Design a protein around this motif. Structure first.
Motif: not given
Ligand SMILES: [Cl-]
Length: 275
Positions: A42, A19, A37-39
């Motif tokens: 993903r 992330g 943060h991490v989508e």
């Molecule tokens: Cl991400």
């Protein structure tokens, strides 16, 4: 109850498969934090934590290790957004990761490696007691608090609950991954952790990792490029046994002759890090 109200975001620290990680400060009390943060898109691996809704596995693992004091960075809070998750994590200050630290200083004197390695071993024993397997133990995942002489584990995002049955999935770092993973795509937790620890200890005393390609990993021959004591070479070569069941347990590592008379974290910083 926004998040950008509670935390003052600072610069980007880095980004990759974990992330994107920023420096921040808790507004309440000026506490240094890390904001990662991490989508959602993903996120490969998902959990539900004893309570019961949907979070990344990483939050379930962090919650399990974040209780009381330890050498792991603790999860302080987390937020679900429409297209991502945000974790608030402790941030030591001043800090250097161990990869940075070894790149700049080269190979560690054995006394410093020993105190560092010992603290990593306590941190991993802690995760294991909490039912957590990290799966990406490596220099870069070890933060040094430069003033306190304390090491802290980061990046549980490829970890798993610990079990006694086989793992068939891996997405940690290949070069710290064990020959049974390369050869068979099968490993068991503790023994694969132990291999990665032999990789890290070699890296600390030599200033680089022993193996670059699959063929080296599976050949498992250890050549020392730097001067290393026999008792240290022995421990490394033990951790790096080709047969998993020929590797030491945590207890055997910590009872090894090389591991005796470890410094305290404060003594460590005083002697090696203050500067
Ligand atoms: Cl991400």
């Amino acid at each position: 109850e926004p998040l950008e109200s509670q935390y003052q975001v600072g610069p980007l620290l880095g980004s990759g498969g974990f992330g994107s990680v920023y420096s921040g400060i808790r507004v309440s009390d000026n506490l240094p934090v890390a904001i990662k943060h991490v989508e959602k898109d993903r996120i490969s691996d998902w959990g539900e934590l004893p309570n019961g809704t949907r979070v990344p596995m990483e939050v379930v693992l962090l919650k399990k290790v974040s209780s009381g004091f330890s050498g792991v960075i603790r999860l302080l809070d987390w937020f679900e957004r429409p297209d991502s998750f945000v974790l608030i994590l402790e941030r030591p200050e001043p800090v250097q990761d161990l990869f940075d630290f070894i790149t700049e200083r080269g190979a560690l004197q054995e006394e410093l490696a020993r105190s560092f390695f010992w603290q990593v071993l306590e941190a991993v024993r802690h995760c294991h007691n909490c039912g957590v397997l990290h799966r990406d133990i490596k220099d870069e995942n070890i933060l040094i608090d430069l003033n306190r002489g304390e090491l802290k584990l980061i990046d549980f995002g490829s970890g798993a609950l610990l079990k006694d049955t086989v793992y068939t999935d891996f997405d940690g770092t290949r070069v710290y991954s064990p020959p049974e993973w390369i050869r068979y795509h099968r490993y068991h937790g503790r023994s694969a952790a132990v291999w990665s620890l032999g990789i890290l200890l070699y890296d600390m005393v030599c200033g680089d990792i022993p193996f670059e390609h699959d063929e080296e990993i599976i050949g498992g021959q250890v050549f020392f490029r730097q001067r290393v004591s026999s008792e240290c070479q022995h421990l490394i070569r033990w951790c790096l046994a080709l047969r998993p069941s020929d590797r030491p347990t945590f207890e055997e590592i910590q009872n090894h002759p090389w591991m005796q008379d470890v410094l305290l974290p404060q003594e460590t910083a005083e002697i090696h890090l203050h500067s």
